[PDB]
Every structure is written in structure tokens, then in C-alpha cells.
Design a binder for this molecule. Sequence first.
Ligand SMILES: COc1cc(N2CCCC2=O)ccc1Nc1nc(NCC2CCCC2)c2c(C#N)c[nH]c2n1
Length: 265
Amino acid sequence: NECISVKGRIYSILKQIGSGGSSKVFQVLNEKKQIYAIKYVNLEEADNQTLDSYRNEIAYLNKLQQHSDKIIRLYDYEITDQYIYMVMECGNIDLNSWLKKKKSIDPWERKSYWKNMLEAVHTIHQHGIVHSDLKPANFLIVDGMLKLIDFGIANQMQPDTVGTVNYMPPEAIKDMSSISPKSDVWSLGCILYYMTYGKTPFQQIINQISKLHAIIDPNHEIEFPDIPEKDLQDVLKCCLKRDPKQRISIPELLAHPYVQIQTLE
Ligand SMILES: COc1cc(N2CCCC2=O)ccc1Nc1nc(NCC2CCCC2)c2c(C#N)c[nH]c2n1
């Protein structure tokens, strides 16, 4: 198969995991048979803005991983005026593909996944990033944890063999005319919801103007089927409050019993 050298090292291409824009992701193996992901970006045609988004991704990636191992790790990279090669921690699969296979989630793994997401999003917040477009696809499963991959600056990748609106916070939709960490809480809540109720809140409204409306509609109430874990019920409820000022914050979520008391009640 094709190969790829990166800063004086050779990797063999198992398969292509993903693509988007002028970039590809490959599952590869190194010299010693270990497994990695490599993102390749063809800069040939690339505006000075798109160019600076890739540059920004790499910098923040390099800074943020010092502060959390819930952020997908970047080990090495080559960047020229022609190309970018990023050698990264390779995920098993992304959370949106895993969810789409409809296998229901062990409650204790859902709770642990939730910790993972909070830790990751919390540390990007602590460096001034509000993702703004969080969705299942931003998380990869490795070492039995969820790890964040795309900080929503450089354009998001898609898996190889559309994209949705279901996680869009209300403030974002009301804002289109003529930015808060709370916005990520809403999207994180929609992911949790999905992990607990099998569906995102407005995943039934198949029509998208219809869907968009519900999200911003103070009198379209979101259902919250009662469940064994009541702390989980309460987390989803405060995460999906439409007034971002009443919505719960990450630092609050980190003090919340769902996360803090290990027996799920
Ligand atoms: C066998 O590895 C995988 C396989 C699958 N999928 C999808 C369905 C079938 C399958 O096997 C998904 C993910 C992985 N791992 C993986 N993916 C990556 N980018 C994939 C895109 C991220 C958004 C959706 C796709 C990166 C990555 C970057 N940038 C840095 N490490 C990475 N690790």
C-alpha cells in the first residue's frame, strides 16, 4: 500500500478513515507495527484564511494536550507551503458512528463518557475556545474514553466508506440577524440526551424549519421520560434550558451529583 513519511519516519496506510475539504485522514501503522491516525491537508489551493485556520488548529492542539488526555493527541507534524501531515492518536471509531449502530449504552459507561466530554470541553474553555458546533462526531473512543478531536475552527471531517442541526443551541439560531461557553453546554446536553433516550430532543421533527423552530420555542417543551438515574434526569434538564443564562455551566456540571457520586441515583 501507499506510505507516508513524516519528519523522517515511515507509516503504512491501513485505510482512509475520513475526508473533508482538501484533507484526508488515514489509519496507518508505524515502523514497530503500532497504529496511528495521519491527517493530510493539501495546501496547494488554500486561501490565507483557510491556511490560518489549519495553523491555528495545530497550535491549540499542541497547547491543549498538555492539560488534558481527553483531547486527542498530536505527536508529530510536518507543515510546508504544500502540505500538512499530522500524526495523531488514532481512535477506534467516532461517537456518532458508534451511536448510529443503535446498541444501547451501559449506564456506567454513559456516565463515564459524560465525564470525558466535560473534562475536554472544560479545558478548551479554559483556553478561550468556545467550540460552538459540538456534536457526537467531535468525540473519538480510545482506551475506553471519549476524546475531543475537531475544535470547530478548521472545517470538520466526514467519515468514508449531510450533517445535522439537532445539537444547535437556541442562542445561535436567534443570533442570525444583521458567544457563550453556555452554547457548548446545550450541545453536550443533546449528546447526553441521545445517550440516554435513544434520540436527540427534536430528532422527531424531521422537517428542518419545523425543527429549527422547536429549538427556539419557549412553549415547545422538551420531554424528559423519568428514569432510574434521577441525577441524570436533572443534568439533561438544566443543560437544555433555552435561556443560556439559566442554563447550567460546565464548572457547575463538574460539581453535580451525576458526576460526583459514583452510585448512579
Ligand atoms: C479506525 O479509526 C477510525 C474509524 C472511524 N470509522 C467511521 C465509521 C467507520 C470507521 O471505522 C472513525 C474514526 C476513527 N479513528 C480516528 N479518526 C480520525 N478522523 C476520523 C473523522 C473524525 C470525525 C469522523 C471521522 C482521527 C483524527 C483526525 N482528524 C485523529 N485521530 C483519529 N482517529
